[PDB]
């Protein structure tokens, strides 16, 4: 239950009181796993779905403008880079681990 094992590749639920008068819980986002189809199984679709490639993370081949950081300034510390206890994580690695078609 330490954050840096619980959310290795997931945005932690930053808690906010408003919306509840009682203990806040969490709010699910629309962050989608990259395409990992089972090996050999056909592309079976029960109903129309949102295509994974249309939601490829922006940190894919994002150009490094400051020589070493895809992040422009420290709003990455507000959007991408999160502090999880004694560890620091960046979702900019997601673009590296995904392909141009949002595949591992």
């Amino acid at each position: 239950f330490a954050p840096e094992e619980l959310y290795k590749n997931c945005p932690p639920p930053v808690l906010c009181q408003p919306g509840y008068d009682f203990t806040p819980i969490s709010y699910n986002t629309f962050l989608l796993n990259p395409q990992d189809p089972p090996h050999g199984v056909r592309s079976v679709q029960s109903n129309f779905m949102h295509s994974k490639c249309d939601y490829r993370p922006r940190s894919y081949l994002r150009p490094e403008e400051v020589t070493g950081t895809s992040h422009a300034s420290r709003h990455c510390h507000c959007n991408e880079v999160f502090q999880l206890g004694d560890h620091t994580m960046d979702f900019a690695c997601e673009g590296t681990m995904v392909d141009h078609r949002n595949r591992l």
Binding site: L32, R56, P57, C78, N79, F91
Partner: peptide
């Protein structure tokens, strides 16, 4: 700015 900034991570190239 905060909303448009956090939309990027959870919507990609939208």
């Amino acid at each position: 700015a905060l909303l448009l900034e956090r939309l990027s991570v959870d919507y990609g190239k939208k």
